Design a protein around this ligand. Structure first.
Ligand code: HEM
Ligand SMILES: COc1cccc(OC)c1O
Ligand SMILES: [Mg+2]
Length: 403
């Protein structure tokens, strides 16, 4: 145990961001829950540590951190419990259920996908993150969470700024931020978000219209007691971050994973019915919310060498859990035909991702149209694919060619 602690003292936030897999491989073997001094927080790395802490509503509550409070606000849906959590879920869940979104797939999602597809067609090359996956993700999600009138460039800037803020976790032994300037993008985005949402909230609070934000304010509420801006805003920032970022990362991770398996990529491009399985494997293989899910202990609780205390962040590395050798065979490989087993990329239990049904449908349509249009698509050998992050993880660029 002493060897493990000595090694953990050497781990930096930079190493976690740039080379997480060997770190989590060792943690799964030696410390299922471990204190990371560089991040002033615990991290759970095995499947069972993540699942147990995620699910156990008696000993753990929804997570938060000083980054969540700075970037999102204090009382966000991730941290909420009891009636407050059920009220926030009542606000945000209904539009994300299949009964609600099913018509929008062909009426809205596919036309949006095809608009971005048409813009890259004929080039024989693209950088799929900025040119395709991110605009699709932010537009298809933004259009269903009240942000139809925010352009894709702004939505992408917002999610990147908020995600950078959450990732700004370097802290000294006393828990003080060593890079407070890394919050400047999130502060700027937060002010812009509030300036967009505040007038809409004020208008729709008094004159509801059936739109997404109107439902967030009024659904499940007495007439005359709608939710207020501050009751919703931290949770809306949760969604602006992850709702907008994660689907593009699912697409990118699945695309990248497929390229590592040439025969599987070929099979998928010619049989779109395999896309749901590919997309599920993409989430397992490079979980977009790799470790940014979290819980807080409600009482002192010990797992192994980790004695966690109230108020301390326990990050759940679902991405490591999804790479756990005790659960999956050769988890480091993308395998379209992997033996069936659930994954934790959407979490589990009462905080299970509200978007877990909608996101795989956006990603399916995005990849269907891409592979139909460009069956010869491939990575450009003149570029490398930079992958980054341990809290939120995904490819930063996907330079491709096609014939
Ligand atoms: C493939 C894409 C996505 C992934 C991988 C993902 C992943 C996650 C994860 C890991 C959590 C935290 C679960 C936990 O702490 O146990 C979460 C929470 C949440 N996500 Fe998703 N997400 C995605 C897309 C979306 C979208 C598109 C939306 C909405 C438009 C959304 C809305 C939410 C909400 C509201 C929560 C909070 C649920 C709660 O705490 O009760 N997510 N997501
Ligand atoms: C810490 O921030 C987050 C963690 C997990 C999911 C999120 O958005 C859905 C999110 O915004
Ligand atoms: Mg230190």
């Amino acid at each position: 145990a002493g060897d493990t602690q000595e090694w953990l003292a050497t781990v930096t936030v930079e190493q976690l961001e740039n080379d997480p897999y060997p770190i989590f491989e060792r943690l799964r073997r030696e410390a299922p829950v471990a204190w990371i001094p560089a991040a002033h927080a615990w991290v759970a790395s095995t499947w069972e540590a993540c699942r147990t802490i995620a699910d156990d509503a008696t000993n753990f509550r929804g997570g938060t951190s000083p980054m969540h409070e700075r970037v999102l606000g204090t009382d966000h849906i991730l941290g909420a419990e009891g009636e407050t959590h059920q009220d926030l879920r009542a606000a945000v869940d209904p539009p994300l259920k299949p009964r609600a979104f099913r018509p929008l797939l062909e009426e809205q999602v596919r036309p949006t996908v095809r608009r971005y597809l048409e813009a890259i067609r004929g080039q024989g090359k693209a950088e799929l993150m900025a040119d395709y996956f991110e605009p699709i993700s932010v537009r298809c999600v933004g259009d269903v969470i009240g942000l139809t009138d925010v352009d894709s460039d702004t939505l992408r800037r917002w999610f990147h700024a908020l995600a950078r803020g959450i990732a700004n976790t370097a802290m000294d032994a006393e828990g003080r931020f060593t890079n407070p300037g890394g919050f400047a993008p999130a502060d700027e985005a937060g002010a812009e978000i509030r300036e967009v949402l505040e007038p809409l909230v004020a208008k729709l609070s008094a004159e509801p219209d059936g739109s997404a934000l109107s439902h967030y304010l009024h659904h499940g509420r007495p007439h005359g007691d709608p939710r207020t801006l501050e009751q919703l805003l931290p949770s809306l920032k949760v969604i602006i971050l992850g709702g907008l970022q994660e689907p593009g990362h699912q697409c990118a991770a699945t695309f990248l994973g497929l390229t590592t398996r040439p025969e599987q990529l070929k099979r998928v491009t010619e049989d779109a019915t395999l896309l749901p399985r590919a997309l599920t494997e993409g989430l397992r293989w490079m979980s977009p919310v790799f470790s940014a899910s979290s819980r807080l202990p409600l009482r002192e609780i010990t797992m192994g060498e980790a004695t966690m205390r109230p108020g301390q962040t326990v990050w759940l590395s679902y991405g490591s859990a999804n790479r756990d050798e005790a659960v999956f065979d050769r988890p480091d490989v993308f395998d379209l035909d992997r033996a069936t087993h659930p994954h934790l990329a959407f979490g589990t239990g009462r905080h299970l991702c509200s978007g877990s049904a909608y996101a795989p449908q956006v990603a399916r349509i995005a990849l269907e149209e891409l592979f139909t249009a460009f069956p010869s698509i491939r990575l450009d050998p003149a570029h490398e694919v930079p992958v980054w992050g341990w809290l939120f993880r995904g490819p930063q660029r996907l330079d491709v060619l096609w014939d």
